[PDB]
């Protein structure tokens with residue numbers, strides 16, 4: 253199983269390289285494998301890395317290519333006019349450009365398999381497409397092929413899709429190699445995956461990364477395990493965690509911090525065509541947006557996430573309602589029973605379901621896990637599974653029974669179709685998690701729940717104060733606990749925005765001084781300061797020198813433990829672009845101890861300015877390196893939905909940033 257052609261160190265400088273004499277007469281049979289290690293840190297908009305063409309007059313559409321875009325996208329064309337075949341397979345956000353100054357060696361493995369009638373592309377260990385066709389076109393069975401080309405496609409005597417870049421190594425095989433052989437091919441990745449397709453979560457997609465360094469040196473990570481593509485809603489989403497005991501080098505197989513069982517955890521390949529991509533798992537309860545903090549006093553780890561029941565909608569579900577009823581000075585969770593038109597029930601002390609019309613209790617109780625019992629007996633519902641077999645999404649019962657949960661569609665008692673905030677705890681630094689409890693309303697009976705700011709909570713150095721940032725319309729709503737997260741109070745901070753996704757992260761500049769950096773609708777990152785450990789908050793200011801899009805992106809922030817250029821330092825992670833979610837940066841600021849102002853002195857580009865960078869998580873690792881877990885793609889763009897393994901982790905050192 254050795255190569256028919258092996259070549260190396262080609263410089264693609266807007267001048268194609270001819271290798272027809274070397275390669276073309278080696279090609280035989282209808283299955284081929286291409287293996288290519290290449291760099292491209294200054295690509296053109298659209299460029300071919302490799303081409304097989306009929307270069308003769310009138311055959312401009314008879315060619316095979318492997319091409320890329322300056323967006324990071326990779327693909328192949330397979331075209332033959334006489335066969336009436338023009339195939340194009342691609343996937344956005346498949347490449348790296350740069351890392352720590354140097355251009356990245358990408359490893360591309362393209363497999364064209366005549367027997368299975370399938371083409372498959374891997375880049376840097378990740379399968380980015382696998383396509384089966386009715387009519388298969390062998391890549392060198394294109395009518396009249398007479399040219400083999402590097403750095404362009406030769407069409408009618410001319411160079412199309414001229415490439416800037418280089419190909420350190422290229423190999424060809426007259427075989428379709430096995431998925432196993434592929435995994436034996438060494439890579440040169442600048443990144444690693446913590447969460448990934450096929451792992452214990454069985455989720456094909458991930459979004460919203462978090463990181464937090466625990467006091468034992470264990471680094472913890474949480475994330476949305478998203479099942480119905482990368483949709484926020486409607487969908488199935490669990491909250492999954494993993495940890496690292498070796499400074500980010502290896503990571504534990506993930507577990508769930510928050511999960512529902514009304515729908516099966518399915519690894520699904522969600523459609524990316526324009527007709528089907530907005531398909532949504534519509535009948536599932538789910539979570540979204542996790543946040544982590546560690547309490548120095550009890551040693552617990554605390555994780556919060558937004559929760560939604562199955563019946564949640566977009567509009568008319570259910571703003572102006574918290575889902576709780578105030579009775580005296582206490583909040584009880586509202587329920588609605590099957591046939592009723594209103595919420596005539598509540599969950600009082602020790603889960604007893606009271607009938608509000610008669611104020612008399614029922615023979616139903618609600619347990620620790622929000623499950624329904626009648627006379628102490630576990631009621632159950634049937635689970636759903638999703639498929640695209642009928643050429644469209646179906647959600648159907650699957651025979652398996654699961655505990656009846658008040659967040660479910662099939663449940664006898666239902667919660668208000670709005671958003672809530674749930675909290676869980678681990679006493680073993682992420683090895684297991686308790687059943688979550690719902691947090692009570694903070695803005696009164698008649699106000700839908702605020703939105704958790706994904707990332708980290710803040711543990712104040714000089715006390716036992718724990719703070720979680722949330723957002724609602726017109727304000728940041730901080731959640732403050734002084735008793736290991738047993739009780740919470742809110743601290744409201746007005747912002748100049750109605751209906752913003754004001755995702756906020758905090759750093760402590762010095763004892764009792766919190767700066768919160770948050771996403772806005774102005775194209776600039778905002779901030780406010782507290783000087784009383786979160787009791788009161790300043791007016792809002794903005795950062796210049798960094799740009800976001802109008803709709804904006806989540807920003808992550810940490811106080812660096814070490815001085816830089818003699819001054820105390822803060823690190824921000826964010827896209828730097830007013831067009832999309834690309835141009836990822838780590839920005840280093842030094843604090844002016846006279847006014848607590850921040851001079852943003854250093855900008856580190858995570859990859860190319862045109863390459864995808866979205867939601868992110870930063871942590872200072874015990875060895876003082878920096879770990880970054882991030883969405884390496886444009887998670888806003890309607891053209892980059894439902895990609896697998898784009899959430900990635902890198903290790904950086906401070907000198908890398910300066």
Ligand SMILES: COc1ccc(CNCCS(=O)(=O)O)cc1Cl
Pocket residue numbers: 484485540541558559560671703753804805887888
């Ligand atoms: C509680 O449910 C939600 C909370 C936040 C959000 C917003 N997520 C924003 C992500 S992004 O659109 O900016 O990429 C959506 C839902 Cl459905």
